[PDB]
Structure formats: structure tokens, C-alpha cells
């Protein structure tokens, strides 16, 4: 559910 770092 967490945001990935681009």
C-alpha cells in the first residue's frame, strides 16, 4: 500500500 520512490 506504500509509495515507491522514483
Amino acid at each position: 500500500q506504500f509509495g515507491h520512490d522514483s
Epitope: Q1, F2, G3, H4, D5, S6
Partner: antibody, heavy 122, light 113 residues
């Protein structure tokens, strides 16, 4: 293959501290969010902590917030869990797990280590 | 948190038979991105959970054809077409649509006698 190996468990006094580590291999560590998940005997897994691949985002389960700290060092392929103010109910097997992603969301814990065991007892 | 409820707690089977296990979420698992982040794990004694199925119906690398998953919204099912001895263990469903990710209590696949 993807491999995760946890270390740092052991027997700790209530109110004590412990720092777990997780050594990652077989993938590009800096590309993946990582998590800690714990399991008490007879019980299901319980997610503990999450850290994103560049550590922009950190999340904790309500049961450990204010006592546990997750960190990572991408250059050393290592994930950490700093545990403080330990309590009897923190006794568990602690697993390191990788989060997979396809676009902008870490959405499944796909590979888990074999675990490091933490016992909190006086 | 999202509550994951598995039934039955224990499922007895004979080798070679079919098995189905159920998982119900207290809240819809359809994400805003349109995916349904519902997964299934198998855990054998002394080992960590291994991923079997992710996003309702996708088999993880190396998982045999006899495993399949289905469902929608809040009701999901894991099906084993013909149970092998290596399939015995505790099955967990899990959701990652909402923070925090949560796990069901487990369904133990045991032997009938």
C-alpha cells in the same frame, strides 16, 4: 535467487533494546521498498515497519510506533530494525521481507527471510 | 485496520483431493488504481511464509498449476485442484490495499482420517 538473511535477535530484558539487521542479495536493493513482519507462536504474521527504496517514506504498526525505528543503507544492501523499550509481547520471530512494485506502489511482500528470533524476558 | 477472516480454521483432506479455503475482508480491497491487492501465503513449520498467489489470481514464480485464486470485493477463495503432501501447512490471506497491510488468522491444511 533473491535472498534475505536476518540477524541480531536474542534474549533481551524488558525495557531493553535490540538492533536487527537484514542482509539482502540477488537483486538491486536500492530499487525495492523493504519491511519487517513479526510472528508470535500460534499467531498470524503481523506487519511491523516499512521503508521505501530511497527512504522517503517510513510507516509503523500502531503497536510499535515510538519504540521501533526502521532504517536502511543501500550501499551495504542492509535493512535495520532498532527496537527500544522492549515488552513481553514483542517476543516473536522477526522476518525481513521485500516489497515488489510495478509502477508507483509497493504492493506485495514477495520474498521473506527465514527470521531472527527475539525473546523479551527477565 | 482491515480485518481478514479465514474459514475454516482447519481443513482436513486426503492426498489427491481438491481443497478450497475462504477469506473475507471487512472492507473492500479494490484500490483506487483499480487493482485488488489480495494475496495468499503458505507457511510450513519452521519456515517463513512463502507467496503463492498475488493480486487475487496471479501465481507466484515457481508455484504449481494446481493452485488458483479468485474473488472480488470482500470475498476470496484459494483452490488446490489436487492436494499433495507438500501442500500441507498453514495458509494465510493478506491485503495490501490499505495501510496497514494485514493478514488473516490462518487455515491449517491437515489430513483426514
Amino acid at each position: 535467487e533473491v535472498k534475505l538473511v536476518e540477524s541480531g535477535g536474542g534474549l533481551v530484558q524488558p525495557g531493553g533494546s535490540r538492533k536487527l539487521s537484514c542482509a539482502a542479495s540477488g537483486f538491486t536493493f536500492s530499487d525495492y521498498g523493504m519491511a519487517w513482519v513479526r510472528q508470535a507462536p500460534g499467531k498470524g504474521p503481523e506487519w511491523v515497519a516499512f521503508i521505501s527504496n530511497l527512504a522517503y517514506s517510513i510507516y509503523y504498526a500502531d503497536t510499535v510506533t515510538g519504540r521501533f525505528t526502521i532504517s536502511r543503507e543501500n550501499a551495504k544492501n542492509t535493512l535495520y530494525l532498532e527496537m527500544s523499550s522492549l515488552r513481553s509481547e514483542d517476543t516473536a520471530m522477526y522476518y525481513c521481507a521485500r516489497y515488489d512494485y510495478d509502477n508507483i506502489l509497493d504492493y506485495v511482500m514477495d520474498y521473506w527471510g527465514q527470521g531472527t528470533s527475539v525473546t523479551v524476558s527477565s | 485496520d482491515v480485518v481478514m477472516t479465514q474459514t475454516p480454521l482447519s481443513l482436513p483432506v486426503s492426498l489427491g483431493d481438491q481443497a478450497s479455503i475462504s477469506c473475507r475482508s471487512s472492507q473492500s480491497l479494490v484500490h483506487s488504481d483499480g487493482n485488488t491487492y489480495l494475496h495468499w501465503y503458505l507457511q510450513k513449520p519452521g519456515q517463513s511464509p512463502k507467496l503463492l498467489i498475488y493480486k487475487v489470481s496471479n501465481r507466484f514464480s515457481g508455484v504449481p498449476d494446481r493452485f488458483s485464486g479468485s474473488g472480488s470485493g470482500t470475498d476470496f477463495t484459494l483452490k488446490i485442484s489436487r492436494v499433495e503432501a507438500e501442500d500441507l501447512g498453514v495458509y494465510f490471506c493478506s491485503q495490501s490495499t490499505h495501510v496497514p497491510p494485514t493478514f488473516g488468522g490462518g487455515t491449517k491444511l491437515e489430513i483426514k482420517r
